[PDB]
Symmetry: D2
Subunit: 368 residues, 4 copies
Amino acid sequence: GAFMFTSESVGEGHPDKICDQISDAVLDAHLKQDPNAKVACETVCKTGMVLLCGEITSMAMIDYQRVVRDTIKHIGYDDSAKGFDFKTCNVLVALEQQSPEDVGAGDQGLMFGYATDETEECMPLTIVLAHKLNTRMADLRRSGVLPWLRPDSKTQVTVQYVQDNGAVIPVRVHTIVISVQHNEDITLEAMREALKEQVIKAVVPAKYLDEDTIYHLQPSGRFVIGGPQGDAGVTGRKIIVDTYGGWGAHGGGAFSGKDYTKVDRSAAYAARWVAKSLVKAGLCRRVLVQVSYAIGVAEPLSISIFTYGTSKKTERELLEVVNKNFDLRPGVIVRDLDLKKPIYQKTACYGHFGRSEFPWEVPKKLVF
Amino acid sequence: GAFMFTSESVGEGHPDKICDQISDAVLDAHLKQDPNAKVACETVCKTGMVLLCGEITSMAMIDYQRVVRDTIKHIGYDDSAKGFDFKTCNVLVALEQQSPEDVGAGDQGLMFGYATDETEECMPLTIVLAHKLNTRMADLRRSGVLPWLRPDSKTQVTVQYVQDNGAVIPVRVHTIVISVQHNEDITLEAMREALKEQVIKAVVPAKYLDEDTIYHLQPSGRFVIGGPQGDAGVTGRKIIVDTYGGWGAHGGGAFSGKDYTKVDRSAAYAARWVAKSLVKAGLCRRVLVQVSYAIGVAEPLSISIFTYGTSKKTERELLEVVNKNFDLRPGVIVRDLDLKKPIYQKTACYGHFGRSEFPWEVPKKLVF
Amino acid sequence: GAFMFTSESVGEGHPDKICDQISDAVLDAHLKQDPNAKVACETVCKTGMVLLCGEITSMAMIDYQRVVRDTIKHIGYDDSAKGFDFKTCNVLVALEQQSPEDVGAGDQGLMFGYATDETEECMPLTIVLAHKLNTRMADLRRSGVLPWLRPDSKTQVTVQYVQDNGAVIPVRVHTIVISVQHNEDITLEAMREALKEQVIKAVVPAKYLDEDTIYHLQPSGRFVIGGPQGDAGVTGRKIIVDTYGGWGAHGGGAFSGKDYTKVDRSAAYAARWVAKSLVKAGLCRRVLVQVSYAIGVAEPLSISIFTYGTSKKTERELLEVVNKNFDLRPGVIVRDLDLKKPIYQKTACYGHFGRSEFPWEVPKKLVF
Amino acid sequence: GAFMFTSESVGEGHPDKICDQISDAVLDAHLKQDPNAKVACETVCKTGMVLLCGEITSMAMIDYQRVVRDTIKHIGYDDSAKGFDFKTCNVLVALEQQSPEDVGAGDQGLMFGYATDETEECMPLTIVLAHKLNTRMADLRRSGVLPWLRPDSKTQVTVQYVQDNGAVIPVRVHTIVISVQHNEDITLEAMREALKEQVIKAVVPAKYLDEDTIYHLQPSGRFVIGGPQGDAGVTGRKIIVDTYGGWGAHGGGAFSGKDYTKVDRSAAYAARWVAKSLVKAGLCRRVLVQVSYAIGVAEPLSISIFTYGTSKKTERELLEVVNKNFDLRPGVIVRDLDLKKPIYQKTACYGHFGRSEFPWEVPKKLVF
Ligand SMILES: Nc1ncnc2c1ncn2[C@@H]1O[C@H](COP(=O)(O)OP(=O)(O)OP(=O)(O)O)[C@@H](O)[C@H]1O
Ligand SMILES: Nc1ncnc2c1ncn2[C@@H]1O[C@H](COP(=O)(O)OP(=O)(O)OP(=O)(O)O)[C@@H](O)[C@H]1O
Ligand code: MET
Ligand code: MET
Ligand SMILES: [K+]
Ligand SMILES: [K+]
Ligand SMILES: [K+]
Ligand SMILES: [K+]
Ligand SMILES: [Mg+2]
Ligand SMILES: [Mg+2]
Ligand SMILES: [Mg+2]
Ligand SMILES: [Mg+2]
Ligand SMILES: [Mg+2]
Ligand SMILES: [Mg+2]
């Protein structure tokens, strides 16, 4: 039942993603000394100018200059011409820091969860490839293979699909668009060649690459001193690339900069968890689990499972499977998923869902 | 086939929405003197401090201090204690301004469109009510009826649904959460009373209000000097409340601050247009139209119509209906929808979809 | 030998003076936990926006948000309309903080010292009155006597003089100009009356007030919401009001924000010390002691005493008196004057010279 | 009657001087299109971040981005590593601009004027050399002779003097300290050599250079990426280097950023004018003319001439000479000195007094 889809992703150098990382870096820096630290911060950046804002109630001694500059360094901004230098950029800290199981969900909410068997990650091929494409570029950048490669990049992958008496089966990569920052001493012809052979063909399964597959490598020509500027960088502005690439559903809640007590993050992770567990357990080929919460109440206020006719069990058979295998209460979520651990920075880029190294990405057994 | 859903919305005073409005205000200010003005700007705010960033190629003389301060005034920030005063706030303008039908879509893209017959607006009841709830508060604020009401507010509406051999029929409002800024001389008991009788019951259809409907009015107590700080307001960070409240699909593209030449805005409007037209023409009760574009190409690169079994015509009968009634090329979109007109500021709050006063909200005939 | 002179001073609310205080407040906050803390910081402010910049090598835990906001509170900025509220203003900290007798003067330098017997403070009458005028207003403000009085103020005092076979004898106050911020509920007539009776006549010696003395109280009319804005506030920009009101000599070195290791502060204090000691010891009625240093060298590189023919001893009689009573080496200065003590904030306003509560203002014995 | 003196100066790259220039650049940009433009602005900078503040009532169309960036370019900040790049730095404009002979002096004031015959410029040798030292470095920088030389520099000159039955005769240059920013590819040994032979010895008269003269060239080692940060540059913070290097007297008034209607600038210029005219006319070898003004009154409120016994005429013979040759009223000053002309930027660096190219530096005839 043919249709096509497109998804995107951005590198660690993207203005918005730098803020997402810095914000989560500050979250990590607190969890390491106080796992109960209340973090609520965000970052704004604009050409060698980083503004750290936020309200964080914690009891740990942190050098914000150090955590911000170290994060910028990690990203690859050490030289001037790159559009950012951790040693010279302005780090204005306007941060306010205080000191002092059946909890109860804060703020009325509605979190979504999604999973599909089109890839081993249980994530849309389009977004998976989009992320992996950026990931590979960072590898070649940090390894030395492609020393002209710079931190800021953007990726878009559009794949042609076809339904199947249930749902979504990828057929081939229709077109790929990739833009990456770079050094001056490297020709546009050499860049486009390396992007096709060393990055695209080194991550995209042969089955999907075609003789007609369209490539748009460095479409706008050069992107040298571009760097993280883009008029300004902000936290929580890359909401769709952090999730399913426009495939599931999204209420609008941002992750980065918020601790484990905010249902926007925790519950979203939990919903992904059960979604991935369901398909992994063969109970369905594609699911959209919807978990609702009521302010004050701990136990979820109605969870809905949305298979697209890919399950044999039948919604409200699968719900009991979830109700017998999962305890989606806020407090239990953080305990079961180990959400007091400082893994948030690595979650701030290349997507929150998909990578198996995260607790919520490890499928639960599911006793049926 | 019961399930519940929740959606939210924010008032004109919300930090993020202030930036969305200011950014669009600058867009309007340019279109009035140069309908071909290229606008690409964004705003950042934090307690009496507004930063205007952006690259705009236009040929019009604009007083940015005036357009920013006037917008803050319109919102209702004229006094000190409110958290913003257009006469005293810092307006730092870092804006860069230059001077000099079958066009061709910029940037590979994938826009979504959605519409449902559960309301006359052809929008989800949950988000419609959420918007109207905030709208009413602004009315009572500007009329004088509720003079304690201040600009910043947040609304959440969760409605219980039930499918119907096709899709989505609202049953009742399960719970409503509303928070609004306010003056000091007004008791929490009087506020909660006015919110229930004068705002909620004055906008929510009797059919949906219940004896069990849960109300959470000013849950966190007092919201006095809670003016636009919310730890830095930003443009394009309220992506879901500007669209369908998490009901359709969203690629992640922001509207505010971008002119009519960016497919992220125009094409999204166009997709909503055809979606609304389809249901209005009786061709379906709920649609998710998906329009894809290819960088360089003008004519859309595959449009998909997604009814949920609510149409009798059958997808790929409805597609020809769309292909015979619509010309979704970028240039034609702006011409047909009159996208060179300065209506963007009023679009920057209370949702981009739903209100009939916008071109894309006027259903096309559809000759079948 | 008649001539006239004018001097000025500003209140604790003056934008520049707020920065001078905040900068010294941060210096005090470090000395209390590490008397060897290396402080080099400055502040910038602009309508509810404070920027703390600087490089300080210390080993003490300081809450910059607390030291900045507490300083703004002390000044009297607690309400909105005053142009500053310590609870709501933006405190952007871009501060960089590290951790780890015959020393030797840093930076080639030339410090000046001045003293005259026209007042018990051994300071020019014009500047003394200018300072005391602002001091009194702060008292009436903090006591409650004049509750309409606000933090920001400016004072100018012009006195008619006459030489005397040696130098400078004040005759009468020619004119007085005073401007002070204020609350709305207070008439311009009542303000000008209180300024003349309760502040001017309560500080200016009867001998100097005349029937012709000109008064300019609140010349520019109102100064309500003025507050610390004045387009921006800066540290080290009120160099002359911090010293002798334009009577001695000034190389241009700023005090506030610099620790005791900078000869600009320490040596300037030392030079004032010897100047005051000389006149107090009857060795002269007016002196301008000039102390020069050489980078690397500890012992002063030539000290010059400049009496205006008011001494009977004779320059190079008085120099030996200084060389036998004083050891102006940097390290000795800080030890003798107790410059590791946190008294710098109170030094940041109303003048560095004149007030006896400071070590350098206590005359040394002088054995001749 | 031996004594020594020291003075300093800074290059066009010094943070404070950049702001002084930018502020005056904005003043020039207005005078060219509206000679009656009311300008009152100031600048703040910090590592690729320039903030333009101010209130200017004018009727001219100015591109502040252009005037700020052009000024930074002129200074020599075009590359990244230099600590500033006019093409990439953040120019935040928070400027507010409106549109619409016997005048009368604004604000009670007291301006000083000074002149000495120790040099042809009628300025202290110490400050003259200090300025010329920086000037020469800019020449070698812009010519190409010393291509490693960068914009930011600081100079200090200490000369040994001796009185002479009247006053001040320079004997020799005791020591010279000069620090200048530089490129990486240049040894500290080569820099110090070029500073002594090509800059110092090319500007300092043979008569003053000695075999004992002490040189401190690049004392602190390397000054590479030391571009304009210096922990925030500011306008009006280099008050003494803009005048007499600590030789005359200074009330504290800043020049840069203020138009010709502010007595702080105009009257100060006028006072220098008469001082220079007096010595040039042989009426004295050293003068300190003091001109006082009264708010509202046009005609100066008492002018005092202070010779140090170097005049044969006798104070109150010279006063009539001034009263018969000069009309120091504000309005007349601007007319006679042509103060509506855009020459203020070149006045913003290397000193306001001394250079003959300025109106106030052209001695008036003086008919006696
Ligand atoms: N000077 C400008 N002219 C036109 N568009 C601009 C300009 N500056 C920024 N933009 C923006 O870029 C968006 C569309 O194109 P594009 O996606 O190529 O930008 P980017 O710089 O690549 O952004 P990102 O990393 O999110 O893609 C628009 O929404 C528009 O606001
Ligand atoms: N809008 C403006 N028009 C004219 N002058 C201004 C304006 N804004 C600020 N000023 C400044 O004030 C100076 C002269 O007058 P005045 O001393 O009354 O200012 P203030 O606001 O009182 O300053 P301070 O506290 O140092 O006196 C000038 O140098 C000028 O730069
Ligand atoms: C040649 S423009 C490329 C810039 C890139 N879109 C960015 O993220 O800023
Ligand atoms: C009526 S204007 C007075 C303001 C005052 N000069 C200040 O310091 O800002
Ligand atoms: K945007
Ligand atoms: K968002
Ligand atoms: K100034
Ligand atoms: K100064
Ligand atoms: Mg980008
Ligand atoms: Mg591009
Ligand atoms: Mg994007
Ligand atoms: Mg002031
Ligand atoms: Mg005034
Ligand atoms: Mg002043």
